[model samples]
Target chain A: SVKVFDTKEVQDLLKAAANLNGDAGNARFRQIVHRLLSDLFKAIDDLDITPDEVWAGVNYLNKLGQDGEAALLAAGIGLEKYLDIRMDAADRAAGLDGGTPRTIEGPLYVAGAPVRDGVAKIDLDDDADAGPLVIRGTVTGTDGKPLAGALVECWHANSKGFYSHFDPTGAQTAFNLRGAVRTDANGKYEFRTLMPVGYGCPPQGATQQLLNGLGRHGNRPAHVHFFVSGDGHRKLTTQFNIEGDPLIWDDFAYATREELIPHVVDKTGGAALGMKSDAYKEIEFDIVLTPLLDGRDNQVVHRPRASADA
Target chain B: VKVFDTKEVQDLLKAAANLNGDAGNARFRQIVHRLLSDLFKAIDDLDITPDEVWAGVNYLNKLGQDGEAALLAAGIGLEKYLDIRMDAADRAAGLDGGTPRTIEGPLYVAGAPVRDGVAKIDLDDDADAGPLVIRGTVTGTDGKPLAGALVECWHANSKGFYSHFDPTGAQTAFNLRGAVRTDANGKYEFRTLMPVGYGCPPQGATQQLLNGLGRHGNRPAHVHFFVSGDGHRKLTTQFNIEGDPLIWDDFAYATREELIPHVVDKTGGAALGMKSDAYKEIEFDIVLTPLLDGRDNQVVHRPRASAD
Candidate 1:
């Protein structure tokens, strides 16, 4: 019969929680926290959240951290993708649109990979069980001219859907299938690598548990991630889903886009292209980046990731 | 500038809602969808900046990385809010209180060695420590003694740290922690060193956010207990040491006036086999309510740690 949500008691407690009268702490932080807490309190009241449910959710947060899957959950639940959507709108308003569309940078990229000019081999040379693939791409600006000397930092899972540093089997070496290739004078970069396989969320991890509750599968199609940057161009984080994967558009991370699906061309004469065998597959793609009108937006947004060197 | 009212944002919300599919756990979907909708509306109404959103995202990552999301919940009063709801439920169910319920903080560890009647929980011999003896009696709502009741008690050492969760690496296993069984007269006693108040990890994500809110993440000197008896509802609670400055200023919102018992100093305690020197004593009593259902006899399920 009585409502506590709009009571003066709750209002006073909210201020106390946010430390409105305290002269300490950051003012901006106080403002943000006050607003956030207000929203949460209202949500809890309106949703009729039960004590048991709230307790369970609190424990879930603890488990989520213990499992080290917070970032994964963020991306899987489309929070990261929603931010990307907002960023796209901001970019349009700033007149910095029309390049390779940015997507969710899943929490897998590692820094300090071996860098090479023009071309390099990123996969193991001794392993011959997987299909030999060459990803050759030209880095260009939105004006259509090639942007020479652009660095394309790329990493992908092996054919077994296992990354190097995070591989569970410990069979892969450090930086295996990961490298940074700088474009030559022609702005063309190439890397000889194995075709990567798609990966799903760890079956028992916190990410997939929520997906299971949502009746969703947490699979991302086989793809190669790239961070391309050059002088005066905004750093671009984009990825290409190799064609033929059934879950390309259905990626749980909501990272798939039509423009990012590259056609994988089957070809022969790989020896002429410096491969040991004549039969090989090839993927030709280009990364187009927008020229930065503001220096502040040119740098890559920082988030926690594996970095060999900070 | 009302972003959430626009068709584009509404369509986006709908698309996100269907990202998983139409078929799933209905309740989970409802909660998730509603929560997301509210969040979008809040973001728009608050005019939250991009920097703030990203900061929040990164903050969540750090919070999880540090395993302090639960601690943050306690510090921010969500746990206290739930306690209020539970208190109302108890009244509605005609289950009146015995002792007030406080948070079962994230630091509780199970399987401390049980003792009979009286035991010494503290193994420390710090000169700065004040020797403490806590004696209590367990009784039912009918005002009858509940003999053989288990009173599992734990508290921080003089340096304000628990055993298993201690970062100082100085405390041994189960130090200052023990479970005492009530005697035939429903008496339980434990001799230990006084506990000091503690604060959240100095540089931890929880403290970091608290600092921003102009709040200090400190809980007063306190002792925790899980008192249980057959046919009685299990109680999870803790009480602050009397006269502690943070008694009412607890960051965890765990303090209640009914829970804070009086502490008395006695000069001669040779009767209890102690030296005839002044020692602090806390005499608190546990009152158990009759269990209304099978569920009431057990503590709510949550992830807890154990040595075994």
Candidate 2:
């Protein structure tokens, strides 16, 4: 059979297959499969997909599973970004826009980073040659009023591209560069942490294979993640990108936004809270969170469900 | 700032960040991403509830786990469909066609026992099993005998199971399997019992799908073959019994006009190394396409222009 399938006809075959089981207690499941297959078949038809195309596809998925990187494929391809786009659109429709545009959390964020009342330090005692930096911010409501007691959760890559408690290298301090703090009565918060370098996608696995073909690289600019939620505000989850980082524009994650980049000027002998010597840097920014009903943004902004990469 | 625009079923908002991250070979990368998007499209369109997807996923998992993937792929026509497509490609290339290639069903194994000129496949203890002999000559498209060609044939006993997968003690490691070489005249012969028509195994997934479609799972009675020679392209095909009840109406649609065998019942005789005189004789002569300068894929049925 040449099997030249048109949209409706293709959809019909798949729809029928899913329904063959009838209401066999899995009717709902069948119905879902039917729906999904139909649309996919429609896509197949619309795209005019040849047999060779899908032959390679199933093999890729199987390879990902074999490599234990099935978890990374989705993020590498940007499924989370699409979903985040959808959520952002819905929020926009609800008049809940503004605050740094949300970017993919890429399957690395972890919960339960011991909470501190006001100020916190993320560079846990591993001070050996740590390039010191300070991040201070005021958490405010979308209405432009500062709200005290906002929880700010943050995490970032070390000079090395690894996450605490996830990758093997960070085994020393399981939660190396992760922290959660609260805004004081003045709605202000700060964090003491080491200056981090840009990170790249897994250097050699499935994702790299994809990027190399596009003549693309998966390096993320040096960045710090911020998760701020205060009273009656939409949870704010975003990243502040380093201004002059090499990969800022050529990010593999496609997460760079003009509004999100921050300046990191060199300041010699300008100190703060306690001690300041050599070359140090400071970044001060404020967050404006949209109101989410009566709840004081107790919502610690989080990633997509599964908290894994797309 | 707005729901201004998107690639609906699969937006990949940031593309690179849009969750359209590709993870492997370029072709695999694009194909998988497109597959994921369209897949999500189907789910969303059908309004399939969540666990419904998981249940189906489990079904796929089991299909691979039970090693029934090959069986069902053929059963669903994909295996044969590939053959037809290749045949079309051959036709378009102005290449002459040979014996129509058919499906090699799940009952084939590579290294079956090899014998000289003649060998009996049925056990002497199993008299009730109908006696059968298949004698054939290997020839090229030139229509001349190709000496020293390997004619390998295998078939299920009166029972539906092949020796390879049978757990019962009755079948040896290679029961009903034998290979014979063509003599000076390109003639090769093997004695074996007729195969029985069998239903699809009662495997959980394959059976359920059949039952749901109100379709029978049994195939027509047939024997499988894999023939090769030094200069001849390897041939993979099977011969279906002409008078089987399911011959033309096979569930697998594997029966082809040219691949069906001519069966003759023999009275008591000492013909073709048959132990008993009352034996079924099959003259399943094979015509192997001799290899061209660089083309050895006789199985694919495609004509290459490199040396044509």
Candidate 3:
């Protein structure tokens, strides 16, 4: 029962694997690679990982890559939430805390949704099955003052829980159920759209396959993604879960936040409001931006996202 | 700040494993639990930044998209480490005999031309390239020759490009690859061009990571083989050509001491009229381990392309 990882030879092999003696590559990359290898070696040693298991892992990764689901897996495995928690702590340490809680932006966001001033209608009109819903929001700083000209980008799944652009059913327009609205002088932004339905992972997709192994469902609660930004304030990346969702707290992505859920109001002024239906539901969410400190450039974390143009 | 050893991380790790319910596969749940635990410890103990975490995640997406995760794993010695572990296991089980198994790499394409005793692998147009002859005898550890043994072999061309995988369309399919069955005397042979050491795609996702780690993604000149006979453990092994500069520094970590066979140059031979001396000869003797306790398993099944 030799613990190969603890052996001096394995240690030397790891050092060589990361090229610790070679001063040619990026120093930071070398440091990271060393830690990665050390930790992996330790895990393999401690867990008694077998050669067959290693090959199985390689095969799974190949399939995972074939599905382009690495990001989705990260979310499902709670790594994304873990990263968010770390960032939250970083924010507290920097004294730039207290704003909308950030959650997973998810993999469904598409860039270049139509932007308009004051109010924007994001949902498709001819899709009569989509129930009328209005989401109005105000963008303000922590000082409680309205910030005019703030951009509030929003996207959500349709009633069928299929997002535009990525909807496999081919039943959606290019930017269906997606748009960006700017705040008015009163710091208010409004978008009329259909209520989004919560969706689960594609039954046979890579993410769901792993979830099946984890004994978890790859589902997110009915939610709307938001990216709120103002000229003098830190940007906010957040989302709001529809109230009363059974899986709101049980979200597989761990993106549900109590503060992000707003009270849903059953209203009767839909036709007067130019909506197709005479009855509607409304949810008002107010976002408070954090003041940017010297080093706090609170921009959206750069990630690969689908773009209509590109 | 360090958070890996904290109660918070431990709590999170516990919840992550049991998040859904107990109905899931217990083995998979345990694997994820341990894997996540180690990964978080690495991140926190190393003070890995959020940017670094996201960078790693995005890099993984590309790695998967390019289908190079296995290739990168081999390059980084993960595969070799597994081989070492297996070797130890074999020794402990008193089954550590015959040829040492090494990495199959990401280039093995199944179903090459097969013949009995001999085959010519190089295409007709590549005959002018440096010629080489490989001959080997298959035997059981009991000193009995194992006739009818299947010897599957593949190697890179002189230009370091494999046939079906070649980006340059200069070679036909199955060039420098073949399968031969041992004759009644346990002898098998093949002819092909002398292979050269090859680097990972210079500007590929794999090489990009290699560059960042200050590692060269080059494997030494070698010939890969899958030797199997009835009632014996299948052998997945390869032999590094002697004297290649990167013989000991293989990026894939597949170089083994017992696998490097001596190559002898034949100056003259009176055999086949107009005997050809423009060839090098490599001789390797293969011994197989017979089935024990009905465990004739030495192959680690992996995803490899096939040309039916």
Candidate 4:
């Protein structure tokens, strides 16, 4: 009680935390602290976060630092999802929404994959457990015209819920489950791959512990990661989800967007478009991009960012 | 620029940043992501180039490399703020009305040698340099004496260096630091030289950060204490000396009004069971809250209708 107590006192200390009198060099830093402190005060009162809870959060942060899987948290908390969401929003406001809805690529994606052009069988595991699946999609511009030669990257967890190049022991090949495809003349692209099992945070890490405490799950819904880049068009990063995955709607990563869930067809009668379609699953997705020239500069101004300065 | 614009980008970023934290790790990851998104928006809004951001980042990188970031946190009163928040919450719960508890600080060390009811913290040097003695009793809120409890104390030395911090040979090893166990009567005493306040490193990055923010980097003289026992929450705090001008404006903001004890003068060369009678004395009592029994009995003392 040295400095006394009250909401006002807390506000005063929050000001102290912000360095309200800092130089221009630290102006952004000050604003960030100030905004966070103000919000935190509200959260404290609104959520009734006990001191015990505060200490628990601090202690958890220490463990989170030790774990070095902060992305897991970013994804877990929905920031990762939001980053993509904003980009899509930006696209939408500027008439860039012609493209497929973008979702977080997630930290599991690996770069430097070889790209190919295929209607199917472009990146298959040939394992029954993987449930031979073909993902075919068209990459097009807003004009409803095909954008041939567009680059598309795709990666996902194995049937056992482990990512290649990341889950060292689970990957069947050095580049297992990691590949990219290019759109052909008709803006069509396809890849043969496994119907990935959903993944979870480290089974016994800070993320898991936090989920348990919050009564949330550690598992993300079954899905593959996507990153698309086309000439004269904004690059896209998104994911496709299994329609019936349990974690689909409540994905731990929160990466599922309605359109991101492809139209899944269960083929089990015989060959349809070649390769015993009856024995595998077929998913059809479509991609469209708005040109960079789409005008909306005035309407797309950074108001929140601008407001932060004050 | 393919995305609508910076503003639209920020809007979505802001939305996600404030996204509901119902997911596991919601409070934590949510805030972090939210803050980061906001920060990103700020940077964008400011039109700050990557270089300035990178420079700020590099500064943090150096501090991270130094591994002494804890001190920097306290240097800005952030640590004290945390203690205040905890205290405030405790007050709201009506569970912390006993002694005002503060942070133990990063300097607190565990495991000091246990001595009898009385011990000397003035190192092995018998020369009484502004000698002082602190005797206190450990009692519960009910006024019952709690014997055999341990009280560990530490304070700055004459040179403004804490024990185990400065060079080993520069001063007595672990000087001005000692432990005294309370007797059956709940009384313990310690002898030590009055500590002198010191200045923070003039050229340290911490000082620079303080200066940039219209702050200083000086802490008032104080003696730290850590008292704990079974059946009670551990109490960690430090008391300052009265009459110190800096007590009112300690850079660390750690001076607690209830904690600053006054030193009484013993004219004509005081005697502290020593060869000479030139030593000083300080006496204060430490009262701890008893462990409240039963979970239901420990919380929410006010009625719902009137509490708010």
Candidate 5:
């Protein structure tokens, strides 16, 4: 017997099937659309779902596409990072361990730093008079054997503490330096640069607008950036904090780790490391990386497009 | 004494200062950043007066209230007209006259009964099927008449009752609906009673919305069709009866002045004269606008994605 079903019922059945199938192909895609109409009919059966809200959602998405890079920040607030956390958990279950904890690479971090051997200053050469600091570190295996000639690449905020690409007024000459320093024979490396200050979020992008609607503020504290990699080990990307600046534990990226925090030394006798006495503050920290599994590939650095290009 | 004067410089400074301002409120931090960028850019771009912004918000609120109906009207109302005029402009610029395209109203139901030559569409035994004759030549708009052109026609009955939708009334499936091909001379004629004006669904969301907007909900008397050929234009159009009371004040406001066919004979005419002495007559020519772009060539029944 041929039977007829209400448009709403058919739509619901279609939607349920599509959700179950995860909308994988042409048949499933059509089912998804069919399900949508079914859902709509179901709504009509239940009560009114304002047409305005539907239009607003469409309009907001249109505007979101126009917001470009800033839209990612908005996605973060919408709990998109929860997916990342899930992926991380899956990887952990697969036995991947101690390769620098992954964190949300918030929309910052510029590329193209000056490269040098052993030590390279990151701060602007002309602005050397503003402030001075040195970051020295060693790259080693978890068993405490130094990895010779390892690359220590770093980037961070300027004296007033704003990152490049994000700070319009900052020097286009790559202020708040980034440089690659190959470790010495004993896997030791050092660089002289100004300590970076923490920066706040852009005041009026989609994320900020939503946060304001929800009543919130945006801020991240002072820290230095570091990426350490060498042969036969998993590349480790992490950040070291300049102790006692407040908001340290509340880093927006959720990147703060107890083991990665540095030992701050005020006016140290490291004059041989090319630092003028009384002219700088210094911090030292070593990075420990896990050995790569047999036949495993090295981790590739992934920076946001604009930052990578810069 | 230290000072930051440049706006860009100031933003950077402020960004740095606010880094530790209230770090615990992650949501708030994100919002502040987004807001700052939009506010700064908004301040830079428009002459956005406070009153103007408020008015804009209020307008959006009202538009939201007029949702689906407004969306329907957008396709059928002034926006449709605007699209037609745009097509006209392009055709005029390129010196082309194609088939006449018309608005496809929301009432078009598929799979109507097909008939050749002539079809008596009065299937319901409710009202008087007053004798009437409609005759016209199917042409290419370039003055070349087309023979055997398929014309699918459908209209409401005398009492303004459309089949399927009028569930309470007993009407045969696909009543008052049929298709015919033009004769050898590009001429096609049908004998049927005139259709009355249609009232929109009453006591529903469509009505509630119109009442809130202080607007009427009625459509003028008209006949709809889908005409096509092998390699020629596939046109969808409606012919409006002239002198209808709601012609100018149609709630949907779909009646175009030039598109209204003129009533030639009321009770006496050569071809329709033999049918009924009291039968009405109307004669009109369809002037088609050519397809200037391929985007306009495709037959699209659904609305295109505009918001996203």
Candidate 6:
């Protein structure tokens, strides 16, 4: 083996690669270097490369840092989905099953919704406009039993058809159209909210800009979001799609799942209003959560603070 | 249009995209973002392009192989040439052109043999060797010759090799290298023999790779050293061969018009031990510009790391 000098240039490359490693511990650092060496030798065995291009690649990554979240979107469309698929495969091998399928949470989730008991009119006190949705559900564990006192936090679009966080003037009210509906003693919960309408992405952002360039649409199908949890159950975070929506199969988040579609119920004659109610569509869903593995709870998601706020 | 609670997410994406308007001051930041967008788009547009990024991969491999020899080639090749050309261009554009610039040769191992008037450098035990006298005056461009100026001089052996690099065994510890002070007339010269011109590493990756790229690996005949003083010009430079075949067509650095070969009196009578015959001679005058900036005194070129 030839002796090599430990120089700053070599150290910089190694340090940068190590910082981007996603493995569990410092062992990841060694693993990353090992892979880098292997890939470098593979390139060498194929063709002799130059140092200038390596510098160019370093500069390219620096640009990615400058690109920030839009670059993250690109990463999502690239390796992130594949990573999720791999995780799903691992869970299958371990026989850990029966929970709402997880999807990419994205970089836009904010915490701290208003809390209510047993029911939440998500579109409360808005303009007198609605889209015929009366969603009722029972939160159950893998043992096929209802879990009482479960928190079925719910959120959806308003009459103007926009999520609270995505519409500033529409809902300066914190967590407007977003709430926590606790499950009653029989594990029953219900809410009245609009069947959210499909919406396009922000018109002039980096994500949409790239979508335009790629000749792809940036619309997501109408959907209602849920985060259901209780003691001794795996916390399930998911979105339930309104069936037959135009973009359901082509949801931008790629969060659509066959099992998460709502079952439409048509109600008529002698409803609580004492008149035939054919104008509204009701849906019922029973959420089945995976049992906690060795009593472990799901990791709580938190919102990061802005530097200005800090 | 969906009303955004905060423009923060979109702003984040815009920042990532590195967009900029007509402002030149913001152009650099925008270029950074645009580069990021390009890379991200590249990842999506070509899912399998990583496999096709062979050119960059191979280029890096060659760079690692070239290593220190590559740095030498850069010194002799377009890097130094470009520096000179840029200085000339800036000077033409009315920028301050301070002192005359020169290439810092590869074998400058700090500290040198300090001597007073004249230093005898050919210390090998060979008795049949001939000697020549070198004399010159160091002066500012103002025509005021400076006395007590220190000239750190070094050259290669007859075989065209420096002391530390080419491993000439036990000839002299600091052979063919010495320093001398200018007399009161600003004149400083020493008695030393002529050194031959040499090529760079001929078979290493530096040369072999360049040859494959249709480039030559030859540098013109030259000697290198630094000249410095208080309230005077400090310079790092080299003197090129007068009539070398690679003078105009130098593979490494350009031997400029001002830094050409000088007076050579080949028939001068020898002084050491031989008869009045068989002597090679050379005399060159050093021209220096005055220092106009405070930064001139602070510039020192020293290697702190290996090229690899």
The TM-score leader among the candidates is 3
Model 2 per-residue lDDT at B85: 49
For model 2, residues B206-307, the per-residue Cα lDDT tens digits are 666556555567788888888888877787788888889899766666788888777887886465556677888888877876676857743532111111
TM-score of each: 0.88, 0.63, 0.93, 0.65, 0.45, 0.44
Could you give candidate 4's per-residue lDDT for residues A221-254 as a string of tens digits? Answer: 8987777777777666678888888878877777
- By lDDT, the best candidate is 3
Query: Scoring each candidate complex against the real one, what DockQ results?
Result: 0.41, 0.14, 0.61, 0.13, 0.03, 0.02
Q: Which stretches of candidate 2 lie over 4 Å from their true place?
A: A1-3, A6-21, A24-56, A125-130, A145-151, A166-170, A182-188, A226-236, A265-279, A293-310, B1-84, B87-308
Per-residue lDDT over B1-308 for candidate 4, one digit per residue giving the tens place of the 0 to 100 score = 23324564554443444344444555655554545555555444554433344344334433434433455656655567667666755666676456677655545544567798987766645342577788888887778887888888887776667766554345565567778879998899987778877556566556665665667677778888877655665677778888787987776677778997768866443455543466566777888766556222222111111100
**Tens-digit lDDT string for candidate 1 (A153-191):** 889988778888787766577788888998999899999
Rank ordering of all candidates by DockQ, starting from the highest:
3, 1, 2, 4, 5, 6
Error at B140, model 4, angstroms = 9.2
At residue A70, give the lDDT of candidate 3.
78
- What would you estimate as the lDDT of candidate 1? 0.80
The 10-residue segment of model 6 chain B with minimum total lDDT is B1-10
Q: lDDT per residue, candidate 5, B208-303, as tens digits?
A: 434443445677788877776544656777788887888876655455555687765565634543445777655544433334442344344432
In CAPRI terms, model 4 is classed as incorrect
Worst 10 residues of 1 chain A by lDDT: A1-10
lDDT of 6 by residue, B122-152 (tens): 6553344345555666777666777777777
Give the fraction of reference interface contacts each candidate recovers.
0.37, 0.12, 0.56, 0.07, 0.01, 0.00
TM-score of each model's chain B: 0.92, 0.84, 0.92, 0.80, 0.65, 0.69
Best by DockQ: 3
Off by over 4 Å in 6: A1-83, A125-130, A159-161, A168-171, A268-278, A298-310, B1-308
RMSD of each: 3.5, 8.4, 2.5, 9.7, 21.3, 19.4
Q: For residues A111-187, could you state the per-residue lDDT of candidate 2 as single tens digits?
A: 76777877887776464554778788888776677789998988887766666765655464745678888888888
Candidate 3 Cα deviation (angstroms), residue B1: 3.4
